[PDB]
Each structure stands twice: as C-alpha cells, then as structure tokens.
C-alpha cells in the first residue's frame, strides 16, 4: 500500500513501477532493474508535505516580514507559515494595526491576530481598558 508511479529506465529503456517517496524526502534516484527508489531527505529551506515523485524538494517561499511572526518554521514537512504580531491583525491580506478605544465605551473584545478591536469610565484611549 506504499504510493507509486511509473518510470522508464536509462540504459536501453525498460518500463517499471517505481515507489514514491514519503513526506520529508524527495526522489534522489529512481529504480533500476535491481534497486528500487532512492529517497533522500529535504535540504535546509526545503520541504515535502506529501508522498511524492519530486525530483527536488519544494522551496519554503513563505517569508514573514515587517509586522509578522512565525507559526510554523520551515522543516522537511512543514512549509513556513506566518501570523500577525501582538499589536496587529490581518485584514485583506496585509497585516494592519490594532484599534485603540478612548474614554467612554472601552474595549469589550480585544484584538486577536484575526480580528480588529471591538468597543463607568475608561481613563484612556488604548486597546486594553475595560
């Protein structure tokens, strides 16, 4: 029940069924008559998430930037993923700032990396006071 793919041999040409490579690995060398598939590990900054017949690993193209922090790094199976830093939230792609709330009707729901701030007395206009 190990995943597979067909392949044709280099020396004269013979048709065979080569085993796929597990997540974390890539196809280093295909099958010969005697040996099956050679699976080598994904190099630094490169990943394979699935069972594959990839000649070389996928590059970790996701790079967190100014206002982004990591969620997963780039390992042999993960691709790097990003999320917004403490005082930021994601809107429409870009990662924008959390909204402050003045005195009056202060913060009822704090800013998550996912949503903006929702909002007796409040002394200050921050994104904290209740």
Curated annotation (Swiss-Prot):
Intrachain disulfide bonds: 18-31, 21-39, 42-57, 60-74, 64-82, 84-95, 101-119
From the Swiss-Prot or TrEMBL record, state where the protein is found. Secreted
- The organism's superkingdom is given as Eukaryota
TNFR-Cys repeats mapped onto the chain: 1-39, 41-82, 84-119
**Tissue range of expression?**
Detected in fetal lung, brain and liver. Detected in adult stomach, spinal cord, lymph node, trachea, spleen, colon and lung. Highly expressed in several primary tumors from colon, stomach, rectum, esophagus and in SW480 colon carcinoma cells.
**Stated role:** Decoy receptor that can neutralize the cytotoxic ligands TNFS14/LIGHT, TNFSF15 and TNFSF6/FASL. Protects against apoptosis.
Q: What name has this protein been given in UniProt? A: Tumor necrosis factor receptor superfamily member 6B
Q: Which organism is it from?
A: Homo sapiens
């Amino acid at each position: 029940e190990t995943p597979t793919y067909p392949w044709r041999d280099a020396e004269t040409g013979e048709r065979l069924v080569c085993a796929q490579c597990p997540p974390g690995t890539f196809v280093q060398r295909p099958c010969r008559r005697d040996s099956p598939t050679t699976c080598g590990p994904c190099p630094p900054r490169h990943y394979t998430q699935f069972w594959n017949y990839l000649e070389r690993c996928r590059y970790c193209n996701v790079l967190c930037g100014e206002r982004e922090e990591e969620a997963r790094a780039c390992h042999a199976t993960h691709n790097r993923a990003c999320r917004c830093r403490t005082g930021f939230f994601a809107h429409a792609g870009f990662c924008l700032e959390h909204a402050s709330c003045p005195p009056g009707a202060g913060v009822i729901a704090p800013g998550t990396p996912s949503q903006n701030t929702q909002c007796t007395f409040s002394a200050s206009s921050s994104s904290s006071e209740q």
